[PDB]
């Protein structure tokens, strides 16, 4: 994820 | 300004520009993920895209209109995700998704790993049609992601 | 802040792609802000  | 299809959406002050998500266009709709644009106004081109509906729950929203996307994972077959990562080109990747078993029920989800940014990316079904949005999802131990198929009601 | 769309492609079924991924079977809670958790 870089949760979103 | 409202022609179907994948669009980034972006963010800039005085400065360059940040890709923060993605949505899809259709029937002149915008739909997104909610913590792409906190559920703010967008531009296209010279026009303004209102927000129109929208849940912090399932992380959506929506522009100009209701929710438009309503084909839903069959629970059985191999699904693509039209990832548009920022600084990259639009590329379909396919993938048989997992199970978000909830209280309330199943939902698909796929364990691709992309950039914050690429939030938004459309789930297609075989017939081209968008089953559900990219980018909410949860952390498993060894720190890889897997997303939520995030899809809307059409009412 | 200028917060701004741009058309990035046709959306369209790739034919011939090869699948990658798994499939985890995940047991999972979502809050009323929208984030998903394990449950564990």
């Known amino acids: 994820k870089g949760x979103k | 300004e409202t022609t179907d299809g994948v669009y980034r959406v972006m963010t800039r002050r005085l400065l360059g520009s940040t890709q923060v998500g993605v949505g899809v266009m259709q029937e002149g709709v915008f739909h997104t993920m909610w913590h792409v644009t906190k559920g703010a106004a967008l531009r296209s081109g010279e026009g303004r895209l209102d927000p129109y509906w929208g849940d912090v729950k399932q992380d959506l929203v929506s522009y100009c209109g209701p929710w438009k996307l309503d084909a839903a994972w069959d629970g059985l077959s191999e699904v693509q995700l039209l990832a548009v990562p920022p600084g990259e080109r639009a590329k379909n990747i396919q993938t048989l998704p997992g199970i978000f078993k909830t209280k309330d029920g199943d939902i698909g989800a796929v364990a691709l790993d992309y950039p914050a940014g690429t939030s938004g990316s459309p789930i297609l079904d075989k017939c081209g049609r968008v089953i559900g949005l990219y980018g909410n999802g949860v952390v498993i131990k060894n720190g890889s992601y897997v997303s939520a198929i995030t899809q809307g009601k059409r009412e | ?40």
Do not use: Q
């Not at chain 3, 741009?6 to 079924?13: H, K, N, P, S, V």
């Not at chain 3, 034919?15 to 047991?27: F, H, M, Q, W, Y």
């Open chain 3, 1 to 40: 802040v200028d917060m701004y769309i741009e058309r990035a492609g046709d959306i369209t079924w790739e034919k011939d792609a090869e699948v990658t991924g798994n499939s985890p079977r995940l047991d999972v809670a979502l809050d009323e802000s929208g984030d998903f958790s394990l449950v564990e």
